[PDB]
Amino acid sequence: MKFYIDDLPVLFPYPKIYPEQYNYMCDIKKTLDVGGNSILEMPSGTGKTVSLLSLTIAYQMHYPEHRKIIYCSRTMSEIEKALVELENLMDYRTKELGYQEDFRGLGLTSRKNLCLHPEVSKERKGTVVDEKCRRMTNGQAKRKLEEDPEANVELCEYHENLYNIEVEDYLPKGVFSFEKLLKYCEEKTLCPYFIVRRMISLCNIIIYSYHYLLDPKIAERVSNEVSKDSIVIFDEAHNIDNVCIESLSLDLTTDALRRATRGANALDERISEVRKVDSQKLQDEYEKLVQGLHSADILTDQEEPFVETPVLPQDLLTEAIPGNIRRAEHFVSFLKRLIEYLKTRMKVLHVISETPKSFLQHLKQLTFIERKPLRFCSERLSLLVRTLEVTEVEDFTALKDIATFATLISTYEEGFLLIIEPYEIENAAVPNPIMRFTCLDASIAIKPVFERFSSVIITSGTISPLDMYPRMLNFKTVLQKSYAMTLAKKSFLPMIITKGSDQVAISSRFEIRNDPSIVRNYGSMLVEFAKITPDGMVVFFPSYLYMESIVSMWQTMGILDEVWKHKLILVETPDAQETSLALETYRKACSNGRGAILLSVARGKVSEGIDFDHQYGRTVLMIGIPFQYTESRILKARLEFMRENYRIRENDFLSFDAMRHAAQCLGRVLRGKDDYGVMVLADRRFSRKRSQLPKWIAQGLSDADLNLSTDMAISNTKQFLRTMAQPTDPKDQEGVSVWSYEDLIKHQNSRK
Amino acid sequence: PRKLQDLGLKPASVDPATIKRQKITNTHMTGILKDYSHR
Amino acid sequence: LRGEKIMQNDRGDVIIDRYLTLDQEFDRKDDDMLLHPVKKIIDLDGNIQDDPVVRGNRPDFTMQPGVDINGNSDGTVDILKGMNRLSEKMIMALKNEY
Amino acid sequence: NKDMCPICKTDRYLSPDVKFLVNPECYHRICESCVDRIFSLGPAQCPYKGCDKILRKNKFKTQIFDDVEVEKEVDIRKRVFNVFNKTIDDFNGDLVEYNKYLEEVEDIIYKLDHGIDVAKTEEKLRTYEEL
Ligand code: SF4
Ligand SMILES: [Zn+2]
Ligand SMILES: [Zn+2]
């Protein structure tokens, strides 16, 4: 349809529109017009991405500011889905306006997911792919070939072919998803990664993940190209704190330090050989360093620093090199003694938690390393590695971790902690000491975003309660609200099971993980629900270890044998490729009617973007509250920091963290309003967490289902499925849950 | 073993002193009833 | 083949045990037979490779495969992979030449 | 030269209480028993093959770092910093001069570490301690 807001015409790509979608678009427009940030919670069963794209695109194409759009999701599959939705919307707009309006919309990702080189795309890790692509595109090979054609160094045809054409003619006008972009770039022998990286500054809407906006290692270069007045959308942003925390966290192991020593020795030998044969490079680098130049002024735009900036751009010192690490040999000795200090600190016999200030003071006492020279470690190492002609950097890969740790610890002092644990795994014959540098404040990484961008939309399907997010991340919202879906008939049945058919309490507490009664009760619940579930059944476990142990117990008891008769069994595995193939097999089994059951981890890879709708997702078994590991030093320190700073109780934060993932898994069942499912939360502890669930799930959770039994839940599930299998009366949803153009006009007239 | 432990060397033995050493009413049915004492 | 953890105490049969390594090789061959590029919609490898320079805090032992005192795998992941491969093989066998 | 005294070959297995000390003069590992037996009466030549530098018992100390080269460099750094000790305010905030001074100190430390100009560098240290 094509309807009108107060002054903004918006073209919806469907003849029908939901009242929730209309209200959501109105609220988003109000937020954009008034300026500031907002928090929106939309039900998972109502089109959210389509409404967001429609309203934002109409806003940008109608108003004269023509503000660009930045879309930030949590996963690459979500980027693909958003790009597909954008392509559909643009197709509708092109069919309605009579012409293809000037528009360019691209996604952005790493080299591993966009490489077409037959010899570089066959790697199992992205770091190696990046290193090889740098070897083929840094310009060293091109310069060597220019000076001497006989040089055996080879180039990348995809990268070379781009120089022939201009940036504005890289791709035709339109929206390019990853699949279409790969097909086009394969047909024309071009590099999609470089196409996107060079067209970000020109696209109307750019779609990427939260890492490309929060992680300073890859965020600075991309952010330097986007506009300052663009709209910012955070889709599925309920789990943004974890990303913000992991952005500025490092872990060092004994193997890492042992490899760093070897890397330092190799660097010293390389410096010696280059000193013997070609020293003018060292002299030139030293001369440039003396004036006060940095990596920005030394490195060309074509090349990149060896060590990614681990701190935010605003926290980098703008002064010249201190002088202690101005020379190659002096810097090498400094780095070597830093590594030795780390090694001698890795010998503690009990957990030690210390602040960066204390660590720096002890360093300055035992050795003579000052804070300022430490702050420049990564930058100096990047310049040195660039100038030493180190085409093979396998030996030097280790020094990156040391540089990152040094530049972080010497940079930040508040909201950061250093934990040294003699036992990385308590269940180990020999000690394996580990040093973790952890960020406790989740607002440090996101402050620059909230200050640089004026209007920020934070939208999600299971972001509740909305009051904590402004508390946890220091930002203020003009409005924060959640929508209640105006269902004509109940389509999803949420229930909580606190005990088994034997009336014995059931829980997923780790200390009682290996309990015959609880394990057998869970297995009986699984079998009974699988017997009645038509096509698909997703089970989410609190942790992978718990899933493994309980599955082994079920295998011994023979419950899996009973499940096999009715459905195939697919299990999530650590290997990402194997998990993806398992997902494909599960979808095929659900489509062909064979019936399948998928076991996964509530905090795993499936729950962070894979969506089960219609035939794929019918019943969701949340086996226990996905509580984090309480006996974790990092989590305990974060809880203490939050209690002291934001006045958030440890129990409250833990319950919020678990309920957030439970709701995340729950919300992957509905796409439209014609989809239905049964959502069983199997734990005695959910009975008091109804107020903590999202509003649209709490409203559907009845008081009689707060504490049920397995048999009674099976009966309710059978009745609910039988009821939902009947044809819906069109009049029951003609104008109460689905609105036509006339109904929308009537709503606008009544409201006005 | 005590001397070996005192010198910090693990002793692979123990002191042997520490080894703790460790009117029936009806009779026409006689010879018929098996003793199902336990289950 | 039943997807049960093998116990070292169990004696087994001498004749049949000769084929265990051949079964390992056959499992590798079947893994290659089943492996193929996956659609970007449900491509989980791309999710982890989206940012190849992610360095944070290593996951707790509850988020990693079970291990024993000696540090080697406990073997419970093997049965999971076995059942997963069984389901995949059945589904693939459905899509035959016929 | 892994876990036993090179002189008396006292293995840690047979001597769990063995503790190895180091001497800055030559940085040669030696056990406390050997130190006591060889240097109790007075100074004597180092008990090593190829080392003829005398040392005193009072100079022995416990090794901090596991790398002898870094230990040597850090000890020489301590000796240098005990003489060349200045702050940013010493140059009235002149960062260029402070950086040049730091570079000179690092060069002196490197020369002492690698024996480039031992006599001249030591004479310069002796003069600067006076001034
Ligand atoms: S330039 Fe593009 S195609 Fe060539 S190696 Fe790099 S990422 Fe791959
Ligand atoms: Zn000795
Ligand atoms: Zn000696």
From Swiss-Prot, chain A:
Entry EC no(s): 5.6.2.3
- Recorded catalytic activity of this chain's protein: Couples ATP hydrolysis with the unwinding of duplex DNA at the replication fork by translocating in the 5'-3' direction. This creates two antiparallel DNA single strands (ssDNA). The leading ssDNA polymer is the template for DNA polymerase III holoenzyme which synthesizes a continuous strand; ATP + H2O = ADP + phosphate + H(+)
Which residues take part in binding ATP?
Answer: 42-49
The motif DEAH box: which residues?
235-238
InterPro entries attached here?
Answer: ATP-dep_Helicase_C, DinG/Rad3-like, DNA/RNA_helicase_DEAH_CS, HBB, Helic_SF1/SF2_ATP-bd_DinG/Rad3, Helicase-like_DEXD_c2, P-loop_NTPase, RAD3-like_helicase_DEAD
According to the entry, every stretch annotated as the Helicase ATP-binding domain falls at 7-285
What is this protein called in UniProt?
General transcription and DNA repair factor IIH helicase subunit XPD/RAD3
Name its species.
Saccharomyces cerevisiae (strain ATCC 204508 / S288c) (Baker's yeast)
Swiss-Prot record, chain B:
Q: Which organism does this sequence originate in? A: Saccharomyces cerevisiae (strain ATCC 204508 / S288c)
Family note: Belongs to the TFIIE beta subunit family.
Describe its partners and assembly state: TFIIE is a tetramer of two alpha (TFA1) and two beta (TFA2) subunits.
Protein origin, superkingdom: Eukaryota
Functional note: Recruits TFIIH to the initiation complex and stimulates the RNA polymerase II C-terminal domain kinase and DNA-dependent ATPase activities of TFIIH. Both TFIIH and TFIIE are required for promoter clearance by RNA polymerase.
Name of the protein this chain belongs to = Transcription initiation factor IIE subunit beta
Report the gene name. Answer: TFA2
- Full-protein positions shown: 275 to 327 of 328
Q: Where in the cell is it found?
A: Nucleus
Q: Remarks, anything else?
A: Present with 1150 molecules/cell in log phase SD medium.
- Coiled-coil annotated spans: none
Swiss-Prot record, chain C:
- Where does the protein end up? Nucleus
* Superkingdom per UniProt: Eukaryota
What remark does the entry add?
Answer: Present with 5150 molecules/cell in log phase SD medium.
Protein role: Component of the general transcription and DNA repair factor IIH (TFIIH) core complex, which is involved in general and transcription-coupled nucleotide excision repair (NER) of damaged DNA and, when complexed to TFIIK, in RNA transcription by RNA polymerase II. In NER, TFIIH acts by opening DNA around the lesion to allow the excision of the damaged oligonucleotide and its replacement by a new DNA fragment. In transcription, TFIIH has an essential role in transcription initiation.
The text of the family note is: Belongs to the TFB1 family.
Assembly, in brief, is:
Component of the 7-subunit TFIIH core complex composed of XPB/SSL2, XPD/RAD3, SSL1, TFB1, TFB2, TFB4 and TFB5, which is active in NER. The core complex associates with the 3-subunit CTD-kinase module TFIIK composed of CCL1, KIN28 and TFB3 to form the 10-subunit holoenzyme (holo-TFIIH) active in transcription. An additionnal subunit, TFB6, plays a role in the dissociation of the SSL2 helicase from TFIIH after transcription initiation. TFB1 interacts with XPC/RAD4. XPC/RAD4 recruits TFIIH to the NER machinery. Interacts with the NER 3'-endonuclease XPG/RAD2.
Q: What is the protein name for this chain?
A: General transcription and DNA repair factor IIH subunit TFB1
UniProtKB/Swiss-Prot annotation, chain D:
Q: Where in the cell is it found?
A: Nucleus
> Which Cys-Cys disulphide bridges does the record give?
none
Q: Where in the chain are the RING-type zinc fingers?
A: 5-52
Note the superkingdom of the native organism.
Eukaryota
| Additional notes on this entry | Present with 3050 molecules/cell in log phase SD medium.
Q: How does it assemble?
A: Component of the transcription factor IIH (TFIIH) holo but not the TFIIH core complex. Component of a complex consisting of KIN28, CCL1 and TFB3; the KIN28-CCL1 dimer is known as the TFIIK complex.
| Annotated protein name in UniProt | RNA polymerase II transcription factor B subunit 3
Tell me what organism the protein belongs to.
Saccharomyces cerevisiae (strain ATCC 204508 / S288c)
Q: Which residues of the full protein are shown?
A: 9 to 139 of 321
